Design an enzyme around this catalytic site. Structure first.
Site, PDB file in Angstrom:
ATOM      1  CD  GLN A   1      10.002 -34.560  50.582  1.00  0.00           C
ATOM      2  OE1 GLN A   1      11.221 -34.285  50.625  1.00  0.00           O
ATOM      3  NE2 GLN A   1       9.528 -35.305  49.608  1.00  0.00           N
TER       4      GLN A   1
ATOM      5  CG  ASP B   1       3.373 -34.324  53.728  1.00  0.00           C
ATOM      6  OD1 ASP B   1       3.426 -35.567  53.417  1.00  0.00           O
ATOM      7  OD2 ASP B   1       2.597 -33.485  53.209  1.00  0.00           O
TER       8      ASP B   1
ATOM      9  CG  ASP C   1       6.062 -37.872  62.177  1.00  0.00           C
ATOM     10  OD1 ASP C   1       5.026 -38.352  62.655  1.00  0.00           O
ATOM     11  OD2 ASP C   1       7.111 -37.699  62.854  1.00  0.00           O
TER      12      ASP C   1
ATOM     13  CB  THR D   1       1.140 -42.814  63.698  1.00  0.00           C
ATOM     14  OG1 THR D   1       2.320 -42.015  63.716  1.00  0.00           O
ATOM     15  CG2 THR D   1       1.529 -44.269  63.794  1.00  0.00           C
TER      16      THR D   1
ATOM     17  CG  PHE E   1      -0.545 -39.580  67.524  1.00  0.00           C
ATOM     18  CD1 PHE E   1      -1.412 -38.683  68.089  1.00  0.00           C
ATOM     19  CD2 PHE E   1      -0.967 -40.890  67.333  1.00  0.00           C
ATOM     20  CE1 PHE E   1      -2.684 -39.065  68.460  1.00  0.00           C
ATOM     21  CE2 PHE E   1      -2.243 -41.277  67.709  1.00  0.00           C
ATOM     22  CZ  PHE E   1      -3.107 -40.356  68.256  1.00  0.00           C
TER      23      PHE E   1
ATOM     24  CG  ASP F   1       4.192 -40.881  65.805  1.00  0.00           C
ATOM     25  OD1 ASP F   1       4.655 -40.621  64.650  1.00  0.00           O
ATOM     26  OD2 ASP F   1       3.357 -41.801  66.072  1.00  0.00           O
TER      27      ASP F   1
ATOM     28  CB  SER G   1       5.396 -42.786  62.475  1.00  0.00           C
ATOM     29  OG  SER G   1       4.932 -41.631  61.765  1.00  0.00           O
TER      30      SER G   1
ATOM     31  CD  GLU H   1      10.436 -37.290  46.108  1.00  0.00           C
ATOM     32  OE1 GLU H   1      10.914 -36.747  47.098  1.00  0.00           O
ATOM     33  OE2 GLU H   1      10.004 -36.680  45.101  1.00  0.00           O
TER      34      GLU H   1
ATOM     35  CG  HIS I   1       4.469 -30.597  45.889  1.00  0.00           C
ATOM     36  ND1 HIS I   1       3.396 -31.452  45.593  1.00  0.00           N
ATOM     37  CD2 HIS I   1       5.275 -31.256  46.756  1.00  0.00           C
ATOM     38  CE1 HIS I   1       3.547 -32.552  46.302  1.00  0.00           C
ATOM     39  NE2 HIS I   1       4.742 -32.536  46.981  1.00  0.00           N
TER      40      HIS I   1
END
Ligand code: HEM
Ligand SMILES: *[C@@H]1O[C@H](CO)[C@@H](O[C@@H]2O[C@H](CO)[C@@H](O)[C@H](O)[C@H]2NC(C)=O)[C@H](O)[C@H]1NC(C)=O
Ligand SMILES: *[C@@H]1O[C@H](CO)[C@@H](O)[C@H](O)[C@H]1NC(C)=O
Ligand SMILES: *[C@@H]1O[C@H](CO)[C@@H](O)[C@H](O)[C@H]1NC(C)=O
Ligand SMILES: [Ca+2]
Ligand SMILES: [Zn+2]
Length: 595
Positions: free
Chosen positions: A105, A108, A110, A184, A186, A188, A190, A258, A351
């Protein structure tokens, strides 16, 4: 020709070619095409979109319009007849810890985020879509079939809003609708730092010159940091317990709260940034705040790449790892680093790895209090059980000592997600993630199962008997044929996940191909890949090789007993060691000598 580049949104391409650091947006990674892999651009299309009307209307939109001569079945009917099961006994993965699901998760988040369109700002169809279940514009309700128990308790539909698309959202565009990737492409970090300059700055501590991320100023975890709260309303984390009134966290990614174990992992990563920035300030007291932030950000990005490609992908792709992701041979600026539309459904294999409960464990890895084990649905948008119920350590012990759910052709998605999912502004624990995934496959114009089998050089079954052979399951093949009438119409999310898993892996051949291709591109197409010569020094790379999730836990919690191989199913105490025996990240090679 037609529109060669519809890039009117975010036209700001201001690149420093010398910078040793990534941009926050992902712009400027690829020198010849600087928008490649940047946030807030279209998802890549590996195959052309497939809409009812060729342009934008999903299959299933118009009742009379078939796909290949058959009506597409209701997403919720597929969910009920194929994806659902009652019995949680025997469904756990005997060789994957719950961290295995949770890292998926994290990776995913990122890489991809296709947020619902923004037409619900002071709009009726925000609650009118929910209230009257009337399809139109961005309202694409998931209608209940006749025998659905939810028809009896929850009305006629679950609300569903179409994903955001490029060349802004309420009017038309240049041929087929292209959904946005808001983060992003990448790998990375994010999800820690943000993909937009505004958010990225909000997350930082610009008070001190120490390159730190902002931490919670209202709550501490036995003196360890929490993410800051998101002080904006309405808050789903306050909604789910209005007594506790504990808000959602504010992280690099919108989705961090979440569920409680995602918030937990985001908490470990924030702690790790601040830990690295403090170590670097010691080695290099001359480094200003910006330098400290960028250097720590660059290390945490490398950490995420290494755990992902060294530890995670091999035990997802199994035998297929070497086929799709050969050993690294350097940066290839001809590779497309963009996340594909189909990847964003392929990676929803996770999932089926989410189990029905979450445990809090004490320092002996024994149940933490009288309600140690909780149903997953009570932990959607749940931050109060962290702030007010023993911080992240008991949850981190559960991530190590408890198992992922195993994908099972007869037990695909737990009812905790399939019947009790909570969505913000929706007030009920009554949604169905499997139905949402199928509806979203259609929202995004996904080619069907056989188009993707052909893309992957795999057989395209045309009959019931051919589907039985590919799925190695006659009852599952029959249910899919009764609903879809042709394997050509099977939505990619359910078709890929229906295939039996590859040896030493946790996905079947179709998903291994789609995932493997994407991860190959994420690595090979990234100028800032940790192992790309020049990004780090050879001595830095030798230090980085020793990173482990186990050390991340040791450094950023009060947990002192950890497994060496945290993605494996590990049992306490036999599989656990003292933090003292676990390699540390040696930052000495970051010591910067001018004199
Ligand atoms: C309890 C755990 C989880 C929850 C509550 C959850 C929930 C959700 C939700 C609500 C969506 C949006 C569905 C849509 O609107 O189309 C979604 C999307 C997604 N989920 Fe999960 N999920 C969980 C676990 C995972 C795991 C374990 C993985 C991967 C290994 C994963 C991968 C994804 C991906 C790739 C997306 C699409 C992201 C995008 O491009 O928008 N999820 N999830
Ligand atoms: C909402 O949050 C409150 C605040 O923690 C929860 O109350 C705790 O509740 C139990 C009673 O079942 C007590 O034994 C705890 O010691 C309480 N702690 C405090 C500080 O009040 C409450 O259970 C939550 N309610 C829901 C529906 O989630
Ligand atoms: C910023 O860092 C300073 C320096 O340690 C600290 O005292 C302050 O609380 C931090 N503020 C936030 C919001 O993290
Ligand atoms: C670089 O990528 C291009 C396009 O995928 C490919 O043709 C080429 O083989 C790649 N270069 C190397 C050295 O693998
Ligand atoms: Ca990213
Ligand atoms: Zn403590």
């Amino acid at each position: 020709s037609w529109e060669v580049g519809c890039g009117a949104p975010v036209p700001l391409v201001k690149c420093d070619e010398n910078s040793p650091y990534r941009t926050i947006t992902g712009d400027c990674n690829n020198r010849r095409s600087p928008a490649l892999g940047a946030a807030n651009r279209a998802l890549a299309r590996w195959l052309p979109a497939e809409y009812e009307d060729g342009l934008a209307l999903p299959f299933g939109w118009t009742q009379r319009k078939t796909r290949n001569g058959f009506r597409v079945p209701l997403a919720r009917e597929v969910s009920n007849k194929i994806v659902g099961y009652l019995d949680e006994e025997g469904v756990l993965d005997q060789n994957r810890s719950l961290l295995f699901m949770q890292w998926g998760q994290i990776v995913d988040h990122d890489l991809d985020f296709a947020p619902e369109t923004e037409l619900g700002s002071n709009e009726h169809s925000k609650t009118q879509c929910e209230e009257y279940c009337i399809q139109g514009d961005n309202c694409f309700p998931i209608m209940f079939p006749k025998n659905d128990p939810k028809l009896k308790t929850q009305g006629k539909c679950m609300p569903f809003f179409r994903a955001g698309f490029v060349c802004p959202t309420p009017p038309y565009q240049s041929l087929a609708r292209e959904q946005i990737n808001a983060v992003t492409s990448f790998l990375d970090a994010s999800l820690v730092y943000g993909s937009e300059p505004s958010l990225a700055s909000r997350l930082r501590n610009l008070s001190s010159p120490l390159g730190l991320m902002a931490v919670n100023q209202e709550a501490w975890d036995h003196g360890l940091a929490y993410l800051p709260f998101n002080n904006k309303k309405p808050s789903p984390c306050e909604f789910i317990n209005t007594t506790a009134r504990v808000p959602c966290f504010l992280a690099g990614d919108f989705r961090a709260s979440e569920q409680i174990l995602l918030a937990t992992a985001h908490t470990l990563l924030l702690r790790e940034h601040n830990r690295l920035a403090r170590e670097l300030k010691k080695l290099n007291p001359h480094w200003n705040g910006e330098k400290l932030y960028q250097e720590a950000r660059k290390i945490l990005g490398a950490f995420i790449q290494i755990i992902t490609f060294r530890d995670y992908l091999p035990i997802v792709l199994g035998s297929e790892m070497q086929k799709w992701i050969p050993p690294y041979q350097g940066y290839n600026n001809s590779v497309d680093p963009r996340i594909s539309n189909v990847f964003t459904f392929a990676f929803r294999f996770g999932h089926m790895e989410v189990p029905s409960t979450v445990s809090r464990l004490d320092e002996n890895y024994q149940p933490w209090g009288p309600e140690a084990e909780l149903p997953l649905h009570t932990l959607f948008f749940n931050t109060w059980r962290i702030i007010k119920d023993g911080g992240i350590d008991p949850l981190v012990r559960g991530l190590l000592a408890k198992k992922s759910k195993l994908m099972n052709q007869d037990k695909m998605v737990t009812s905790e997600l399939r019947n009790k999912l909570f969505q913000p502004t929706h007030k009920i624990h009554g949604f169905d993630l499997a139905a949402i995934n199928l509806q979203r496959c259609r929202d995004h114009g996904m080619p069907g199962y056989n188009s993707w089998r052909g893309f992957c050089g795999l057989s395209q079954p045309k009959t019931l008997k051919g589907l039985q052979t590919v799925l190695k399951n006659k009852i599952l093949a029959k249910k899919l044929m009764d609903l879809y009438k042709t394997p050509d119409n099977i939505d990619i999310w359910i078709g890929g996940n229906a295939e039996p898993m590859v040896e030493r892996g946790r996905v079947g051949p179709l998903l291994a191909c789609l995932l493997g291709r994407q991860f190959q591109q994420i690595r090979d197409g990234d100028r800032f890949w940790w192992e790309n010569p020049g990004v780090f020094t050879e001595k830095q790379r030798d230090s980085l090789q020793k990173v482990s999730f186990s050390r991340l836990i040791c450094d950023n919690t009060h947990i002192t007993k950890v497994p060496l191989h945290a993605f494996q199913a590990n049992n306490y105490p036999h599989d656990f060691v003292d933090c003292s025996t676990v390699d540390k990240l040696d930052l000495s090679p970051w010591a910067s000598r001018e004199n």
